[PDB]
């Protein structure tokens, strides 16, 4: 489907850096980090790259904290 | 610039009565106000984690250690800052109110601990449940009150400086 992803669970002193960092492997066309919700809203190239970040960050760990990692609620 | 009003809400009140403290100043060449607004960040988080249910544990662990790392330099620097106040006044005030930061965030850290295992838990009673979380309100609340203090006396101390060439925090409002 869609290239919009939206990331729950980020820390609390979590940093823009550490999101594109995380998604390193991937063409951020967008990205909007929320500290108060620990929440981003990222963009990417193509509906596979979204495919891929959903596949290999949808329950992982960023220093500690679970993530879940979905396409951004259509 | 935290928003009005899934959570815990004494939680979120403590984080956001820190936050508005730590904002009234730029975070430029003032490490005391960044840490700050990290805690309230990591303090929100908290109210958040201490729903979560479970994947929760390790969090609210991982975040108690991190909210202890941000006390760790409030409380070193607000120390610099007390070695170069020239007012016994002040420089006292300043130490009494950081000497407690390190207890009650270690505090914070054993009773998330605690609440991290009940977690999940149902055999677990529910008076003993609803008592876990508000040791932990408590103590949120008594380190963020602590740590907006701190920066307030440490800016107080920031008036009578020894030295120039000494330590020095930016107190520049925004």
């Not at chain 2, 899934?6 to 979120?12: G, L, T, Y």
Request: proline letters at 2%.
């Amino acid at each position: 489907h869609m290239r919009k992803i939206l990331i729950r669970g980020l820390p609390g002193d979590v940093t823009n850096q550490e999101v594109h960092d995380l998604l390193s492997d991937y063409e951020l066309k967008y990205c909007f980090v929320d500290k108060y919700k620990g929440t981003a809203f990222v963009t990417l190239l193509n509906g596979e790259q979204a495919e891929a970040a959903i596949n290999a960050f949808h329950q992982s760990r960023l220093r500690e904290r679970e993530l879940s990692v979905q396409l951004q609620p259509t | 610039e935290f928003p009005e009003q899934v959570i815990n809400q004494p939680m979120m009140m403590a984080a956001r009565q820190l936050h508005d403290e730590a904002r009234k100043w730029s975070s430029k060449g003032n490490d005391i106000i960044a840490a700050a607004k990290r805690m309230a960040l990591l303090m929100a988080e908290m109210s958040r984690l201490v729903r979560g249910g479970s994947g929760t544990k390790r969090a609210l662990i991982q975040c108690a250690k991190d909210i202890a790392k941000a006390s760790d330099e409030v409380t070193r620097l607000a120390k610099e800052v007390a070695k170069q106040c020239t007012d016994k006044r002040i420089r006292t005030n300043l130490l009494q109110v950081c000497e407690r930061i390190p207890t009650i965030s270690t505090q914070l850290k054993i009773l998330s601990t605690v609440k991290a295992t009940m977690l999940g838990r149902t055999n677990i009673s529910d008076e003993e449940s609803e008592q876990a979380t508000e040791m932990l309100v408590h103590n949120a609340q008594n380190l963020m009150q602590s740590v907006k203090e701190t920066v307030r006396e440490a800016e107080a101390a920031s008036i009578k400086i020894r030295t120039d060439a000494g330590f020095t925090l930016r107190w520049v409002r925004k």
